[model samples]
Target: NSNICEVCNKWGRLFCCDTCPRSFHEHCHIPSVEANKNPWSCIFCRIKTIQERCPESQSGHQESEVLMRQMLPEEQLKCEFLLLKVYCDSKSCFFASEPYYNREGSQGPQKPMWLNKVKTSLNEQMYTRVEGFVQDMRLIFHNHKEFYREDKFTRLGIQVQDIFEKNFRNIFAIQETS
Candidate 1:
């Protein structure tokens, strides 16, 4: 990618993600980033870690990712993965910063959902149920869709919702949202 950090846009010996074109200086990025972890994923691509858990699907993959009442540790990581994946994309990243209140008279974010807050709560263990995590993610997309319709932000939101919903189902081994 560019020599400058995508987060800070400054020139330095930078860290790069294996999945996306974006790069960032270590200081400008997340703690999950470490030195010399070759094929080190940025926060977003780290979601793929769970796929590694089932890589050898030769047989005996009977365990389910779903759980009742609350999420297990591995399940929580899948939640983190979904959140991280949202953080990677550009237009969606813009929406996550702060919902637009004045984007061409758009009525943006009634309750104001954003990805970083979802991320913070996830890491803080504030989510007691898998349902809680799923609701918050849906809210992130909901807020965006509420504001922009048949517009650029709306377009990005559609694709983003697709990313989140599909990965969420796969990661948690679900049949459908309902």
Candidate 2:
């Protein structure tokens, strides 16, 4: 049966399933089966095979389950922070280069411009942990205020809490931040 490519809708260079009518773009294969060489199986077919083999346990199946076992709690936190750092760095309000302020417009009161930046930075799951992260940041900021408050540090565009930043780099072994 001829079918439209399951991914990217518009058809081109599709890999069709030999056993079934389902089809996919060469680029859209989940684990990326080579269109020219490898036999095709979509994610659902692979998952079905996994279930049939180990229906009860199903322990080592799925891409997420493999990576989930590999990351420690702190490693996950570091990843979350890395995402936040990237999002934070992109927003000008996160930098201390200007005087930031919020004002009431036609509505009763509106959120600060920076609030939108913060909201867009994380998912709902990560957003739920913001209170705890905010507290940790507050403590770190208070503890290392002098280190980051100096004119040299402030002029260099360092606005994030210093101790937290240090811990993130050290824990994650992340040599680069941009």
Candidate 3:
């Protein structure tokens, strides 16, 4: 039986591997799709940490690719993870009030000198709470965010929630603003 390579559209090419009986173009192989290697590693072989090469199927495999890039219209795009900045005003008697601006734009909490001063006392319980919250927010951001063409709004929302929850639970009745 003759099959075509999924990438180069070449016939008589093996789909998967040499022994798998699966046919694919020499270029169709995940590693060779770009004409870089031969007997290329298929998606399953390319993936090492988690399964599911294209996200549709999950072999529980994962890749150890850091700074991975993807093809996008007009350019090669990469992941741009959103950053979260958590503000609270419980320590300075609520003097370090934060602004509740829309993070979608260039709007966020207003940082005053007093807020900076409040953070000076890092040994305090509230400050410790704030630090912990930041770490957790980073974690939540990573967990909720996925690799894609652009930013993920829902992931950003979850990150904001993480910060909010930590702030409220750290100091009850403290009002936060943009």
Better candidate by lDDT, 1 or 3: 1
- Computed on alpha carbons, the lDDT of every model, listed in order, comes to 0.66, 0.42, 0.33
Residue 140 displacement in candidate 3 (angstroms): 30
Identify the runs in model 1 with alpha carbons over 4 angstroms from their true place: 1-31, 34-69, 103-106, 150-152, 176-178
Candidate 1: tens digits of C-alpha lDDT, residues 35-90: 58777777545545655666642222222434344777666766766665555555
TM-score of each: 0.62, 0.32, 0.21
Which scores greater on TM-score, model 1 or model 2?
1
Worst 10-residue stretch by lDDT in candidate 2? 106-115
Tell me the tens digit of each residue's lDDT in model 2 across 65-85. 323343344333443444334
Report the Cα RMSD per candidate.
Answer: 5.7, 16.7, 19.8
Residue-level lDDT of model 3, residues 1-178, one tens digit each, is 2365543345774545532444455433422334455654444333321223344332221221211212221111000001111332122222232323334434332332223332333213232233332333344333333321155544454545565455433222223344
Instruction: Give RMSD (Å) of candidate 2 vs. truth.
Output: 16.7
